């Protein structure tokens, strides 16, 4: 359940710990993307911890020994935690990139904190109701 | 798990396990089909430089669940005509040996403590 | 290791020309409306990628520059602001970037 | 590009779409499973008594898993989970054309998606008028005990008390192996729940947990002959003889909720 | 609400049907016996039918030292010295041949497991077979005792000083020098107590069987 990654367990966390870092600071970061969907799940929990509250002493300790930067501390409980107060879930919304063109053809993938001030990324669209296929299938529905 | 080595208590009140001894006892032989001995399962004991039959009455391996996991191995001393060596059983020694397949009525009319 | 005689190109021409080791054709292909360029069907386009990341790699300078020091992140919400776009009472008890550049037509 | 363009079923569906798409399958399934619900009612062919040297046919089903059971004896004994899913009669072969000995039906469980699943595969399960199954499986079916295609299989087919042979594909370990059919044979049902279709079967069952297996009656000389006394056919829940009891016991078996056994 | 252990769910892809056919024999079955609520550290006799023995039922006294299982396989070990040997128990719940189960002393200890008493003084584990029952209150949570068991020689059956085990029922100081703390902390692994991929809640789910239990009654 867990990718072999880091010259061992403590570099996997502590890559994870600069990783998770770079996206609180920033709130997009660009990876790789099996890196980007291994975070994935930290970040998610790491807001849960932000909703648990502020006064919660245990979320002081996870979340000081994940973020290096400690004047990122007041803004996950006073930023992230109020701003993910309403969704339930789903916080972190990461997309594939197109491969590095660095020789290495590595696998590319953009991971940020949804509801952040920077533009939106373009995401992909379904077809639109109009088409052809769609209204045919709109008939159907209207006739059930 | 009685096997090879395994230094073992020889409970029993025969002359040769009764009286102490600097050498620690090395189990020589187990009287089964299989390698390894467990409680009701004959073996061969040195005691004092003599070689005498023993019968398993408990161990350290972990057991079936709703049963006594002791933490000595403990043995009880047979004669060759079968009859316990030793008249007298001190550690409690586990009824289950009545319904085991073999003759275990001789140590168990031995036995004056069952848990 | 060396074969005990030396290899034909004939026999070399047929292990090369196998199609096993012949490079294989792509039908994934797609194109990208919003930048009109080419694209896989499960890769984003990158040429309006590209704008999105450099849009942000300015708003990031503003940022830096309005911050003024390391380790100064705010422990408020922070919101965008470009010309011709004045803060309002929503955006008081926010962090305001203020871009020189009118209000991107992608961006809203 | 003149060319050919890799599609999936959720291309090209919209969002109000692909919602009334998932419903609308739904339905399908529903209003299908619903109309072979009853095969004694559609024109049933003729079934025949039983006499020696008779085979039924078998089932497949799903390996949930293994829990402890105990028997009246206060033994324990731990029992593998076989859940029969959407057994249902596809195909039946004539005895000349498929096997001059014996003829053999085909049976098919654990309904599965349509989306991603060859149009051919559909087409044969469309005139069928059932939804496609995960898995085909050729059973040898004396003439006698022939059930016309589409009938309906219930785990009650088998019967606490009966051997079974269970035959299914090990777990594959890779480069190293597995991955490989095997037979089990002389398993003894210990319950079968009829509400859920699950059968206990004693001993352990080849594959991991969640898999398909193949469920026949035991082929040991000694039960040569254990249909007689069991539904010779099949157990047909249409036909409604007697309602069987949700959960069918064998007598050893201590049921929960009985007194706690006292070995006197 | 006291929630036993064995109903909770372990995560996994089996089935939860298989959970709601098991819980139901379990219910089922806790009316023919009743399972007194216990903790690790509590002294238990159990009323147990004997195979060996025929027409005859005994009862073990010892002190909770493990719970391990779920569903109707669940079991628990008790443990006591008797004639001087150590003895543990791993009693299964649901077994129908325990007649009884009584809680002769509900109590719970440090530590959630106390393997290492057998590597503590035989004191501590020694309990009398026919001590009476003492009084609990209902409306209080069960004592907890925190008397820091002593350890026999360094070489024990398991390496409890190190911060993997890390019991906190252990008087290390008295035995160990805090130099051999420091080598066993080498295997502290601090960035395990910080990792959010080990961690699974299962508090809705404890929740929801709460009145799934109730309403079965
Ligand atoms: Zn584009």
Redesign the pocket.
């Given at each position: 359940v867990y990718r072999r990654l880091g010259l061992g367990p403590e570099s996997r966390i502590h890559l994870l710990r600069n990783l998770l870092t770079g996206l609180v600071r920033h709130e997009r970061i660009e990876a790789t993307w099996a890196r980007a969907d291994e975070m994935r799940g930290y970040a998610e929990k790491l807001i849960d911890y932000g909703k648990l509250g502020d006064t919660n002493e245990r979320a002081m300790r996870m979340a000081d020994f994940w973020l290096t930067e400690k004047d990122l501390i007041p803004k996950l409980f006073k930023v992230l935690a109020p701003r993910f107060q309403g969704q339930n879930g789903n916080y972190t919304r990461m997309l594939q990139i197109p491969n590095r063109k660095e020789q290495d053809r590595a696998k590319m993938a953009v991971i940020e904190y949804k509801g952040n001030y920077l533009p939106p990324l373009?995401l992909p669209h379904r077809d639109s109701n109009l088409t052809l296929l769609n209204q045919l299938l709109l008939g159907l529905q209207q006739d059930l | 798990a009685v096997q090879k080595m395994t230094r073992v208590r020889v409970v029993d009140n025969s002359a040769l396990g009764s009286t102490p001894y600097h050498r620690p006892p090395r189990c020589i032989h187990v009287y089964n089909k299989s390698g390894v001995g467990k409680v009701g399962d004959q073996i061969l004991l040195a005691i004092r430089g003599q070689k005498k039959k023993a019968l398993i009455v408990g161990h350290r391996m972990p057991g079936s669940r709703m049963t006594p996991k002791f933490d000595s191995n403990n043995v009880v001393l047979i004669e060759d005509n079968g009859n316990p060596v030793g008249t007298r059983i001190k550690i409690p020694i586990p009824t289950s040996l009545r319904r085991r397949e073999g003759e275990y009525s001789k140590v168990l009319a031995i036995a004056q403590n069952f848990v | 290791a060396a074969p005990k005689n030396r290899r034909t190109i004939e026999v070399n021409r047929c292990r090369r020309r196998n199609p096993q080791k012949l490079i294989k054709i792509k039908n994934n292909i797609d194109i990208?409306?919003?930048?009109?360029?080419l694209?896989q069907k499960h890769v984003?386009?990158?040429?309006?990628?590209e704008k999105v990341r450099q849009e942000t790699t300015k708003i990031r300078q503003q940022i830096g520059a309005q911050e003024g020091g390391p380790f100064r992140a705010p422990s408020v919400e922070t919101m965008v602001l470009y010309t011709g776009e004045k803060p309002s009472e929503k955006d008081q008890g926010k962090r305001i970037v203020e871009r020189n550049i009118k209000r991107p037509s992608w961006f809203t | 590009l003149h060319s050919k363009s890799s599609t999936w079923w959720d291309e090209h569906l919209s969002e109000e779409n692909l919602s009334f798409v998932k419903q609308l399958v739904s339905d399908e399934n529903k209003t299908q499973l619903t109309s072979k619900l009853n095969p004694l009612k559609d024109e049933p062919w003729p079934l025949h008594p039983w006499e020696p040297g008779s085979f039924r046919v078998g089932l497949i089903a799903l390996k949930l898993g293994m829990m402890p059971l105990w028997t009246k004896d206060g033994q324990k004994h731990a029992v593998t989970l076989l859940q029969v899913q959407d057994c249902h009669v596809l195909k039946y072969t004539p005895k000349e054309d498929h096997n001059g000995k014996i003829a053999a039906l085909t049976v098919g469980g654990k309904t599965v998606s349509r989306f991603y699943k060859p149009d051919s595969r559909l087409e044969f399960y469309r005139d069928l008028g059932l939804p496609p199954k995960q898995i085909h499986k050729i059973f040898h079916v004396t003439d006698n005990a022939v059930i016309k295609p589409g009938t309906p299989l219930y785990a009650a087919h088998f019967r606490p008390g009966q051997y079974v042979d269970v035959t299914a594909k090990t777990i594959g370990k890779g480069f190293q192996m597995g991955n490989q059919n095997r037979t089990v044979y002389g398993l003894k049902v210990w319950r079968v729940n009829t509400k859920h279709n699950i059968i206990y079967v004693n001993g352990s069952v080849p594959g991991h947990k969640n898999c398909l297996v193949k469920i026949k009656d035991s082929t040991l000389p000694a039960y040569k002959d254990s249909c007689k006394n069991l539904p010779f056919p099949t157990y047909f829940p249409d036909g409604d003889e007697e309602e069987l009891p949700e959960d069918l016991f064998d007598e050893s078996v201590w049921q929960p909720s009985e007194p706690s056994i006292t070995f006197a | 609400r006291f929630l036993s252990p064995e109903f909770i769910p372990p995560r996994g892809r089996t089935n939860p049907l298989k959970f709601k056919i098991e819980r139901k024999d379990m219910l089922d079955r806790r009316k023919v016996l009743p399972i007194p609520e216990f903790y690790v550290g509590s002294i238990l006799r159990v009323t147990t039918a004997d195979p060996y023995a025929s027409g005859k039922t005994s009862q073990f006294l010892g002190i909770c030292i493990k719970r391990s299982g779920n569903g109707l396989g669940a079991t628990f070990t008790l443990r006591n010295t008797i004639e001087g040997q150590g003895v543990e128990i791993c009693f299964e719940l649901y077994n129908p041949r325990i007649q009884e189960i009584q809680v002769v002393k509900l109590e719970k200890r440090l530590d959630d497991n106390l393997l290492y008493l057998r590597d503590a003084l035989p004191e501590y584990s020694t309990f009398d077979v026919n001590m009476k029952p003492v009084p609990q209150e209902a409306c209080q949570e069960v004592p907890v005792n925190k008397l820091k068991v002593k350890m026999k020689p360094k070489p024990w059956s398991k390496r409890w000083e190190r911060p993997n085990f890390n019991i906190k029922g252990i008087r290390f100081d008295l035995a160990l020098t805090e130099e051999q703390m420091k080598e066993a902390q080498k295997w502290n692994k601090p960035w395990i107590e910080f990792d959010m991929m080990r961690e699974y809640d299962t508090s809705k789910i404890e929740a929801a069987l709460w009145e799934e239990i109730e309403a079965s009654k």
């Amino acid at each position: 359940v867990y990718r072999r990654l880091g010259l061992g367990p403590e570099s996997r966390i502590h890559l994870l710990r600069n990783l998770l870092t770079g996206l609180v600071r920033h709130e997009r970061i660009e990876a790789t993307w099996a890196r980007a969907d291994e975070m994935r799940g930290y970040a998610e929990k790491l807001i849960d911890y932000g909703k648990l509250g502020d006064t919660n002493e245990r979320a002081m300790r996870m979340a000081d020994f994940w973020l290096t930067e400690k004047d990122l501390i007041p803004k996950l409980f006073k930023v992230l935690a109020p701003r993910f107060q309403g969704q339930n879930g789903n916080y972190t919304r990461m997309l594939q990139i197109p491969n590095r063109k660095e020789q290495d053809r590595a696998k590319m993938a953009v991971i940020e904190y949804k509801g952040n001030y920077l533009p939106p990324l373009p995401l992909p669209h379904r077809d639109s109701n109009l088409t052809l296929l769609n209204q045919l299938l709109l008939g159907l529905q209207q006739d059930l | 798990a009685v096997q090879k080595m395994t230094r073992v208590r020889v409970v029993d009140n025969s002359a040769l396990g009764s009286t102490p001894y600097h050498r620690p006892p090395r189990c020589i032989h187990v009287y089964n089909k299989s390698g390894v001995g467990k409680v009701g399962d004959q073996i061969l004991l040195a005691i004092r430089g003599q070689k005498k039959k023993a019968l398993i009455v408990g161990h350290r391996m972990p057991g079936s669940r709703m049963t006594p996991k002791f933490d000595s191995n403990n043995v009880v001393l047979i004669e060759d005509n079968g009859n316990p060596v030793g008249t007298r059983i001190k550690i409690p020694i586990p009824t289950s040996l009545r319904r085991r397949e073999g003759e275990y009525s001789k140590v168990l009319a031995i036995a004056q403590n069952f848990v | 290791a060396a074969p005990k005689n030396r290899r034909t190109i004939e026999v070399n021409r047929c292990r090369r020309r196998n199609p096993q080791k012949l490079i294989k054709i792509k039908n994934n292909i797609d194109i990208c409306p919003e930048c009109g360029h080419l694209k896989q069907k499960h890769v984003l386009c990158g040429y309006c990628y590209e704008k999105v990341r450099q849009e942000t790699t300015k708003i990031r300078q503003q940022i830096g520059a309005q911050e003024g020091g390391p380790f100064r992140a705010p422990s408020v919400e922070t919101m965008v602001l470009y010309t011709g776009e004045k803060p309002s009472e929503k955006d008081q008890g926010k962090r305001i970037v203020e871009r020189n550049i009118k209000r991107p037509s992608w961006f809203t | 590009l003149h060319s050919k363009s890799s599609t999936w079923w959720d291309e090209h569906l919209s969002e109000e779409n692909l919602s009334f798409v998932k419903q609308l399958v739904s339905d399908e399934n529903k209003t299908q499973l619903t109309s072979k619900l009853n095969p004694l009612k559609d024109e049933p062919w003729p079934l025949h008594p039983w006499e020696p040297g008779s085979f039924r046919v078998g089932l497949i089903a799903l390996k949930l898993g293994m829990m402890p059971l105990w028997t009246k004896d206060g033994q324990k004994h731990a029992v593998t989970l076989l859940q029969v899913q959407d057994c249902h009669v596809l195909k039946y072969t004539p005895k000349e054309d498929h096997n001059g000995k014996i003829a053999a039906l085909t049976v098919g469980g654990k309904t599965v998606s349509r989306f991603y699943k060859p149009d051919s595969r559909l087409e044969f399960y469309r005139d069928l008028g059932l939804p496609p199954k995960q898995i085909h499986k050729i059973f040898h079916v004396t003439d006698n005990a022939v059930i016309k295609p589409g009938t309906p299989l219930y785990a009650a087919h088998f019967r606490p008390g009966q051997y079974v042979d269970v035959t299914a594909k090990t777990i594959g370990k890779g480069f190293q192996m597995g991955n490989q059919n095997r037979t089990v044979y002389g398993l003894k049902v210990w319950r079968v729940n009829t509400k859920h279709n699950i059968i206990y079967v004693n001993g352990s069952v080849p594959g991991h947990k969640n898999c398909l297996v193949k469920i026949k009656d035991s082929t040991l000389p000694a039960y040569k002959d254990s249909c007689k006394n069991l539904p010779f056919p099949t157990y047909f829940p249409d036909g409604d003889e007697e309602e069987l009891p949700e959960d069918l016991f064998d007598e050893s078996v201590w049921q929960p909720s009985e007194p706690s056994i006292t070995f006197a | 609400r006291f929630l036993s252990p064995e109903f909770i769910p372990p995560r996994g892809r089996t089935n939860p049907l298989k959970f709601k056919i098991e819980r139901k024999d379990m219910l089922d079955r806790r009316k023919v016996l009743p399972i007194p609520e216990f903790y690790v550290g509590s002294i238990l006799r159990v009323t147990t039918a004997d195979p060996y023995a025929s027409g005859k039922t005994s009862q073990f006294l010892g002190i909770c030292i493990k719970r391990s299982g779920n569903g109707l396989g669940a079991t628990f070990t008790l443990r006591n010295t008797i004639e001087g040997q150590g003895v543990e128990i791993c009693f299964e719940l649901y077994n129908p041949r325990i007649q009884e189960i009584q809680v002769v002393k509900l109590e719970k200890r440090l530590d959630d497991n106390l393997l290492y008493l057998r590597d503590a003084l035989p004191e501590y584990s020694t309990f009398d077979v026919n001590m009476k029952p003492v009084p609990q209150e209902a409306c209080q949570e069960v004592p907890v005792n925190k008397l820091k068991v002593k350890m026999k020689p360094k070489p024990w059956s398991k390496r409890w000083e190190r911060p993997n085990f890390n019991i906190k029922g252990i008087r290390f100081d008295l035995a160990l020098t805090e130099e051999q703390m420091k080598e066993a902390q080498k295997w502290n692994k601090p960035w395990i107590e910080f990792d959010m991929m080990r961690e699974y809640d299962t508090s809705k789910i404890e929740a929801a069987l709460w009145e799934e239990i109730e309403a079965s009654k």
